[PDB]
Chain A
């Protein structure tokens, strides 16, 4: 009995051998033109366009059938699940000419596939963009505005029976190529040849299609930004795609071998499928694992999203991290460490164990993964918010914030690590636990709250000369004046108004008076209302060493009478303003003010019998 088989780009000549187990052993005029657009890519859909018979399709799925140009479209798989794919097919037939079978007659033609793929999108917007694509692709067989935007949203991938110098990758390129196609008109398309089961077909397609579908799901995950940060996550997904590739290749080998048999009762092949449903390689289980890994991605992502807002240095490479941590400029280092992310997975091992030795489970268990429930991720999210808070109150030159992953079974979920210089001080930081201000000897302690200050030129007296970006100010008037200018007293304020824990240190030389004030201080008086310390709004510490507040001066004992570097530490909510002598790594306490700050205080100075201050 005579049969008709689709050439599928396979080189066919007028008299040739063909085995009906679809291996191929190596002039009438029939003009026809047509085109078809499909918004699908299942094997059933690709088969429907290429008019592939159930038998040939099954042998193609089994991998027995190789393909030629244009038919290479069959081997063009959609990368992502959540991606719009609209294929345009131009199909033309030109002429007709005239193992188990011999070729008697063959129909000649040549077709082309314009495979248009959108970028990975959300699940909800795939239908909208698919319709949009169909619409503008429907316009292509014509020999735009917002529509133009869409044409630049998707790429093109061509599979043709025509020899092309340059292949289209653009919508513009596709129309340019499409316009040229009718002139380029030839390879055998349909083959006549003479001799010399519906449950298996469904089971072959359904089994293999299912795996393909899971591997697109895996790909969506791999394209995730959070996956690219967490290498152990990246590893597991790569391992799962390999497991599936190896599983599908195994099935295909048996299918191709047992398909040929059609001498053997098909019962054996049926059993492989029956066995597959009984195995942990059931699609419910493979998808269930995907779902678990998807959950891990969301808990790590939600954590990262919290942290990122603190603008930390996210170093996942231990080499770069510890060289970054142990830098000269890093006085205090605070790391948010992920302590549970692991490359090892119980179910992935079960799957590899079934591939090599055809187990512990047939389903992945929520009991094998930390990220399954809510308590561990919830406390991970808590430490994240705390980390961000510390980051907000410690946004300075001394304290540095990092994010990394260091697996440790003794710590759960994550932890806030505190490194100072070369060592790890604590693996679960919460507070610096600052000592009593009159008791501070270690400079680092105060540097937890490093405070950069620049002088406000509008407040500075005309006598004062400000330079080096308003960090240095020397005590010869200036013509310029302001409504916020200190007209009588030689005083200057900073731009920042402080309400917490701030530590600034300066270089001073002569008669300088350092302190804080409310902006309520008068600018234009030769009265108590405008001099620092003579107010109930101002605190001062000047050298001739006195402490002024509420027009009350008291002496302060200083062993090193003339010192260059001065340190000032404000603890606004506690109500203390401390003065220190700074020398190298150590700090000498000089005087502390125990009061109540009724407003945000502005660091201010009194200079001039001439002085200079260089803010650091």
Chain B
């Protein structure tokens, strides 16, 4: 007599059977329902729960046995080591029917498994305490209810259900419904312990690495970096194929033994590139890669820097009209084709010493560059024509990472540090000033009653028929003057399409708004402007003083303006397409945030001013 648990696989009386665990093809009622809690998901605990013996155990490792219903619980394995799992086993024995091997007697009964898993975040005992109550309760602490709410359930049973449990609540009402045909539970059959543990030890070791690989795969960054994702992904597939080779070897040798042929499988693993030490070592290196890339990528988090998957995506982003300057932080040392994963593949079809992420110099210099990058990101936060991106493109020329720079859609350099600029009077290329080019908007609270506005990007003075604007202390009462909303604290460039009698400049918010000497631009210690009076020509005004300015091309439509608040500079240029002709620059000490300020002239003399 040989008794074994009737796994989901069907059994009938007098049915033939083999010791390679394949099956060739008076009753006294029992009627009892009880439970058990399995706090461990170990292969041994699964076996203890289902009363699986040594012969069937080893045979299940070779995967020769077919399972079903409840027995699918065996196949259900923990994906992540971090999660906590408690399972509730329901058992119902009801009818006992009597009469290489033949089945004489078979016990009939259905049983179910309620696999409860906690979030990826002691949580083991606390879970079993809550689960213990399932057979005791019928649809319990506020604290217990919150734990039960964050638990996931999986059903494995010999029942055809009208609904499947996903919730703790669902598992309770399902469990209540469970006692209300039936399958063989236990069968009676009538016609190496030394290695069983060594084989079990080998497979649990392998499943440990499998679970490690999966954990490594669950990062957000890994998913954002296809080069590192496809690496782990490939290892996953390779290692999965290897685990089949090993199980097939066990499944092939097991009928024959029914001994050292089994040990051969174990010894080959230790001698192959599939060694626990070899595979572990590699996973230590891919984990360090993810660690370093995380340190760098983590810096740019919460800013306007964008991750891009490949060159095709980077091309699209940099090729946009608006992106005149694109500096991209790129990981150059993550390989497209892993040499160790080649060995592994090449082994199936038949040196981390010096690895980049294990270099004091490489990681230090890369971290310094990741900061250089962040500095630009924050510096050029309000620069509408400067775009920031991150990607990983394998480049032999650089170690760890580098900064690529794309000027007007075309690659300039693969090793950028800083935009080199001339001194403010030496600007000739419009592109250079576009590094600092920002969006300006007119402040509807300061706009004079007779200046009409656009989108708030176009100001034109009315001749008659004055505009109705709400009463605000911030507002020019008796001057055709307007200020922007943007308070400038550093390097900024803006263009304007100007016509008629107008001035373009800057002013502190602490400037008078209500017709005096103190409220007119260039007649304050608080206002600096370049005025255009077609009758006289061009001049700059500050502290009631006027200065003659020579304009190479009189009546030029577009005016370029660059402010460096940190130094006391404010420069004016004639914008001709993609070229700038420096008109006049001047120096001043700027005490507080500086606002773009404009006058559109008095009386019959009129101006028109458009922000670009």
Contacts and interface: CB of A to CB of B under 8 A. Distances in A.
Contact of B606 (A96, A104, A520): A520
B160 A33 contact: yes
Interface in A474-518: 482-484, 497, 499, 518
A520 B156 CA distance: 89
B interface secondary structure, majority: loop
Contacts of B535: 598
Interface in B62-76: 66, 68-69, 72
B160 A94 contact: yes
A68 interface: no
B464 A182 contact: no
Interface string B310-324: 111101100111000
A194 interface: yes
B244 A377 contact: no
A29 B181 contact: yes
Contact of B69 (A93, A381, A483, A520): A93
B160 A182 contact: yes
Contacts of B425: none
- The interface size bin for chain B is 35 or more
A295 B160 contact: no
A195 to B, nearest CB: 11
Contacts of B110: 31
Nearest to A291: B312
B416 interface: no
A298 B313 CA distance: 9
A67 B501 CA distance: 82
Interface in B598-612: 603-606, 608
Contacts of A497: 460, 608
A407 B161 CA distance: 66
B248 interface: yes
Contact of A34 (B156, B557, B606): B156
A1 interface: yes
A499 B499 contact: yes
Interface string A569-590: 0000100000000000000000
A202 B244 CA distance: 11
B113 to A, nearest CB: 11
Given A31-B158, A182-B160, A298-B319, A123 B313 contact: yes
A142 interface: yes
B350 interface: yes
A324 interface: no
B68 A600 contact: no
A142 B182 CA distance: 26
A195 B181 CA distance: 32
Q: Which of A33, A105, A139 has the most CB of B within 10 A?
A: A33
A202 B66 CA distance: 24
A484 B463 CA distance: 7
A599 B500 contact: yes
Interface string B200-243: 00000000000000000000100110100000000001001100
A199 B164 contact: no
Contacts of B69: 30-32, 93
A598 B155 CA distance: 85
A202 B183 contact: no
Given A44-B237, A295-B312, A374-B409, A33 B68 contact: no
Nearest to A519: B463
Contacts of B308: 123-124
Nearest to B322: A305
Contact of B183 (A30, A185, A521): A30
B157 A33 contact: yes
Interface string A101-140: 0001101000000000000000110010000000000110
B161 A33 contact: yes
B411 interface: yes
A240 B306 CA distance: 32
Contacts of B258: none
Interface in A510-544: 518-523, 537
Contacts, number: 181
B328 to A, nearest CB: 15
A298 B315 contact: yes
B490 interface: no
B22 interface: yes
A194 B24 contact: yes
Nearest to B316: A298
Interface string A137-180: 01101110000000000000000000000000000000000000
Given A34-B156, A598-B535, A127 B311 contact: no
Contacts of A96: 10
A143 B23 CA distance: 38
A596 interface: yes
A275 interface: no
B408 A378 contact: yes
Contact of A31 (B166, B183, B307, B348): B183
Given A44-B240, A521-B604, A198 B248 contact: yes
Nearest to A36: B154
A4 interface: yes
B207 to A, nearest CB: 16
Contacts of A138: 166
A374 B20 CA distance: 67
B606 A519 contact: yes
B18 interface: yes
A35 B164 contact: yes
A306 B321 contact: yes
A28 B10 contact: yes
Nearest to B313: A123
B319 A32 contact: no
A141 to B, nearest CB: 5
Nearest to B311: A291
Interface string A302-338: 1001100000000000000000000000000000000
Interface string B292-314: 00000000000000111111110
B535 to A, nearest CB: 7
B604 A537 contact: yes
Nearest to A599: B500
Given A31-B183, A93-B68, A600 B465 contact: no
A302 B157 contact: no
A302 B10 CA distance: 65
Contact of A182 (B11, B25, B162, B248): B162
A2 B534 contact: no
A520 B315 contact: no
A520 B463 contact: yes
Most chain A CB neighbours (cut-off 10 Å) among B158, B316, B349:
B349
A427 interface: no
Contact of B12 (A28, A298, A522): A28
B98 interface: no
B159 interface: yes
A346 interface: no
A547 interface: no
B309 A377 contact: no
9 contacts: A32-B69, A33-B159, A92-B160, A142-B166, A182-B160, A192-B23, A294-B312, A499-B608, A573-B557
Interface of A: 1-2, 4, 28-35, 44, 54, 92-94, 96, 98, 104-105, 107, 123-124, 127, 138-139, 141-143, 182-183, 185, 190, 192, 194, 198-199, 202-203, 291, 294-295, 298-299, 301-302, 305-306, 374, 377-378, 381, 458, 482-484, 497, 499, 518-523, 537, 573, 596, 598-600
Given A44-B240, A203-B349, 13 more contacts: A32-B69, A33-B157, A33-B160, A105-B25, A124-B224, A182-B161, A183-B162, A185-B160, A199-B349, A295-B312, A374-B409, A483-B465, A518-B606
Interface of B: 8, 10-12, 18, 20, 22-25, 66, 68-69, 72, 110, 155-164, 166, 170, 181-183, 220, 223-224, 226, 237, 240-241, 244-245, 248, 306-313, 315-316, 319-321, 348-350, 408-411, 460, 463-465, 499-501, 534-535, 555, 557, 603-606, 608
Sorted nearest first, the 4 A-B pairs with minimum C-beta distance are A520-B604, A29-B181, A598-B534, A374-B410
